[PDB]
Amino acid sequence: SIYQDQEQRILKFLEELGEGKATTAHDLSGKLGTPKKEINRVLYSLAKKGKLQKEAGTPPLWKIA
Amino acid sequence: QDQEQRILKFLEELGEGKATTAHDLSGKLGTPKKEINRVLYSLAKKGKLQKEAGTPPLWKIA
DNA sequence: CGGCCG
DNA sequence: CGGCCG
Structure with a gap:
């Protein structure tokens, strides 16, 4: 499934970034060439x-929990 | 422009005292709620329209 | 400007 | 659930 392909590309990207480090939906959107909304x-x-941990702020930061 | 007059026209044919939500508006003019x-x-x-902060927010002629 | 929302 | 937002 595409939706699942996009969840994995996202997890793969965050894991490659490293379990500590975090990034924004925008960078994610840009790097994967997938609309920010999606x-x-x-x-x-x-x-x-519970897979990912969202750190509040603006814009929010996201990392593998 | 055309949309500004339509919305204001509906908010007029409605009553300057009676408000309304974008949703009732969007689904009454066949237009995206974003528009x-x-x-x-x-x-x-x-200043042409008045907004009553809320959830949803209500709009009426100013 | 945070917006995921359908 | 507020969302207009490019």
Whole structure:
């Protein structure tokens, strides 16, 4: 599934960045060439489950929990 | 422009005392809520429309 | 400007 | 659930 392809590309990217480090949906969107909206829906969904950790701020930071 | 007059026209044919949400607006003019809100927030900044902060927010003739 | 939202 | 936002 595409949606699942995009969740994995996102996880793969965050894991490659490293478990500590975090980035913004914007960088993610840019690097994966996927609209920011679609990146945030996955980002917040993966976080809603507990896979990713969202650090509040503006704009929010995202890293593998 | 055409949208500014439509929205204001509906908010007129409605009643300067009675407000309304963008949603009722967007689904009454066959237009995206994004458009409605763009116009709405613009018309209010100019003073032509009045916004009552809320959730949802209500708009009426100023 | 945070916006994920459908 | 507020979202207008490019």
